[model samples]
Target chain A: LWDNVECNRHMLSRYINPAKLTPYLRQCKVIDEQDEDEVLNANRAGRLLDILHTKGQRGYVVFLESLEFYYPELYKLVTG
Target chain B: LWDNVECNRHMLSRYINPAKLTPYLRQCKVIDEQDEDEVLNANRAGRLLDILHTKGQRGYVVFLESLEFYYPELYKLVTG
Candidate 1:
């Protein structure tokens, strides 16, 4: 466990330097509280329920999807 | 499927405004080719194998992890 942590960090730094990303990271604007509520209450609630009943399929997990909506700046940073 | 696509898109747009994120997304720097090779060959290779054998645990997926290295700008865009 310990070995992988260091290894993962090294691997991450080698591939991604957080310093370089800071500029963009800093650019990210804060999302509105209402937006957060809509996702938690309106969208994700239904989707999660659908998943629970059907036993699920691909693309059902929505945590990242919600992140994409609420934090597009950060989403672009990680996903790019 | 079509219904969800439209619904998802609507939901996505409501929470995340792509236009707002464009500035930061544009700032994302390109990673080196060698960096990609390092993760694909050295890091993800082992970690993915570890996952396949161990039946996996949370945080094992390294696609985003690799992206963190190659695109911290983007990572910050999404995660923040």
Candidate 2:
């Protein structure tokens, strides 16, 4: 059973996927120096996918599509 | 209130779930300038379950059988 969760250094540092966090890195700004930003970096991608698992086909695709338009540049980076 | 970004397309486009990237209108080595290689050229069945997160104690016997096969290679890819 998969889950998208906030990073917890104590329990999950080994499982953190850096490539998974790249998008979070670029999307963030004004981060604290000591923040385990690398570890706790919020993951909207995995979170969104997680939403899909629970919400299934009933998700608000319109809400999702709107967010999509807002970040076209982001899409090009990871998929291309 | 929570998250990294509203799922940057660019971010997701980077290290996408391999199965999500597959089924694109990929053609043979016949295309020009398109350098897409699947983040993983392989697909595992029942991807909806991330065995790593899933396989709770109850699922061990079944999951172990499953893990012992296909995902062993996947494990090597990451652990190495």
lDDT of 2 by residue, B2-72 (tens): 11111222222233353432223122221112322322332132121232233244343333334334445
Identify the leading candidate in terms of TM-score. Answer: 2
Off by over 4 Å in 2: A1-45, A75-80, B1-66, B70-80
Lowest summed lDDT across 10 adjacent residues in model 2 chain B is found at B1-10
Fraction of native Cα-Cα interface contacts (under 8 Å, chains A and B) also present in model 2:
0.00
lDDT of 2 by residue, A1-80 (tens): 12122112112223334344334433442122233243335532443343333434333332233234554443333233
lDDT of 1 at A40: 40
Worst 10 residues of 2 chain A by lDDT: A1-10
Please name the candidate that would achieve the greatest DockQ relative to the true structure.
Answer: 2
Q: Which ranges in model 1 have alpha carbons more than 4 Å from their true place?
A: A1-80, B1-61
Residues A1-80 of candidate 1: C-alpha lDDT, one tens digit per residue: 11111222222223433333223323332222333343344412332222222323222233234336554554454444
lDDT of candidate 1 over B1-80, digit per residue (tens): 11211222222323432333223222332223343344345424332222222323222233335435555565454443
